Design a protein around this ligand. Sequence first.
Ligand SMILES: Nc1nc(-c2nccc3c(=O)[nH]cnc23)cs1
Ligand SMILES: [Zn+2]
Ligand SMILES: [Zn+2]
Length: 342
Amino acid sequence: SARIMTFYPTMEEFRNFSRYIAYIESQGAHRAGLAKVVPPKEWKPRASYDDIDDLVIPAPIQQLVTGQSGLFTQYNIQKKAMTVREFRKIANSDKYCTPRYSEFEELERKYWKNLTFNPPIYGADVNGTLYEKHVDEWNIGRLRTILDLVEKESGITIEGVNTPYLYFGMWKTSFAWHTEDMDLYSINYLHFGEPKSWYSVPPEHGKRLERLAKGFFPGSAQSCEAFLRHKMTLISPLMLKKYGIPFDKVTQEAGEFMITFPYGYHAGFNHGFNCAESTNFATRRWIEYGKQAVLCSCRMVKISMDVFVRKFQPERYKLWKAGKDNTVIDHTLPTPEAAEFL
Ligand SMILES: Nc1nc(-c2nccc3c(=O)[nH]cnc23)cs1
Ligand SMILES: [Zn+2]
Ligand SMILES: [Zn+2]
């Protein structure tokens, strides 16, 4: 019942990325807003990670968290550029390393208890890829989805959106509740290290989480229509439970992929020193989400939907451009590409 699903594709199933997203949607994976994909054992994107210690993290961020009673605001403080070595030194030090724990529920408890203490540093938004040049399956650098149209027609690039981002984590580093820019899909691969825990709200209950955040942060909601887009709001699983917001949790381990679906609210934290690579992608189903996404009004990323409507919805272009497209999204419907599996 809209629970996070895990998939284990064969090497043959793994070779076609877009076809596999259509397959996981025909299985109802999009309903949770988050799905896990475990690659075939024979697949590796890079032979070793012992040769990246001198890699530059240009803008590392000290994550300052303020709040109480399961409601917090994350302030990012830019620090001087450092290497993966200097970063790992701080990450694996006694001051910033992972505390001792028996089960995930205990580490999750420590996270929500200590989130405001000892601000960690996040090696976030590093422009790059750790994939070897001749890796042809699930290459984050080149997924080959319909999102490619923006770069194809204009050549414009949006860092981390249609290019890959690297994220060097440490214990207690986190990402606030949010949906992707333009309500796009996202792919996350944990290259190595300690796990990454994720929280997810099904897209069909997403307007509920927004309403709740508006009630808890009225000043923030008055200044911006979509303040959650600022990626500063942390809401504990206990608060979500209290206010009856349906959600699920999952832990991503090194060598696994996490996929977020359009309008899928997600949050989470790093268990310790690790590295993840991510980008956004799209399917034909995303078009409607992109046309209807509520963007930051104070305040940011904005993609012109005209090329997508022109190519995939030509009949509705005149109606849509005149403000007469009164289409209602059904979050339970899979992507049209999934037709072959249904
Ligand atoms: N659209 C965006 N998605 C994210 C994001 N989404 C999911 C996971 C992460 C993460 O682990 N670290 C940093 N950012 C993450 C940041 S901006
Ligand atoms: Zn995200
Ligand atoms: Zn805003």
